[PDB]
Design a protein around this ligand. Structure first.
Ligand SMILES: CO[C@@H]1O[C@H](CO)[C@H](O)[C@H](OC(=O)CC(=O)OCc2ccccc2)[C@H]1O
Ligand SMILES: [Cl-]
Length: 152
């Protein structure tokens, strides 16, 4: 965790991206993801993970998954011991092919609060303790300009 917090920003990561989060996600922590949905994207996802194991797959405390089929949606879920739980689906989605976005994930004591382009998008209640999250995963069809962290 750099003293100059601007030095913790990750620029132009290759997708698929996996990175260690530089400190624990305590209440008040922000994760800021700037990017662009490329032409013909089907879906992309941001995963807050407990480790980087590929097989068996690392637990995912928070799966945030924009999908571009038909009217579009966002699917949120949690992965434990390689099995998905019950999906929470948001149909009021701000994501579109060939549009830029800024995602802000705010870690609260009880939930994640997600805003896109400065507007509230969704809430996701913690299912796994957020103190187990150490890894950020970005997968699918997206271009990421930058990843930043604001720790309390
Ligand atoms: C019933 O459909 C499933 O809904 C789940 C959420 O409810 C996930 O969205 C899942 O996609 C995935 O399993 C996530 C994915 O695209 O995998 C990429 C990946 C990342 C890390 C390890 C292995 C695969 C999708 O197939
Ligand atoms: Cl940062």
């Amino acid at each position: 965790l750099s003293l100059n917090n601007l030095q913790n920003i990750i620029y132009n990561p290759v997708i698929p991206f996996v990175g260690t989060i530089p400190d624990q996600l305590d209440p008040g922590t922000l994760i800021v993801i700037r990017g662009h949905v490329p032409s013909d994207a089907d879906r992309f996802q941001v995963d807050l993970q407990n480790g980087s194991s590929v097989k068996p797959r690392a637990d995912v405390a928070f799966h945030f998954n924009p999908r571009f089929k038909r009217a579009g949606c966002i699917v949120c879920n949690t992965l434990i011991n390689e099995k998905w739980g019950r999906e929470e689906i948001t149909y009021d989605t701000p994501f579109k092919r060939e549009k830029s976005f800024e995602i802000v994930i705010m870690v609260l004591k009880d939930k994640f609060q997600v805003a896109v382009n400065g507007k509230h998008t969704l809430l996701y209640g913690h299912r796994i303790g957020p103190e187990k999250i150490d890894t950020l995963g970005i997968y699918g069809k997206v271009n990421i300009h930058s990843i930043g962290f604001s720790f309390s």
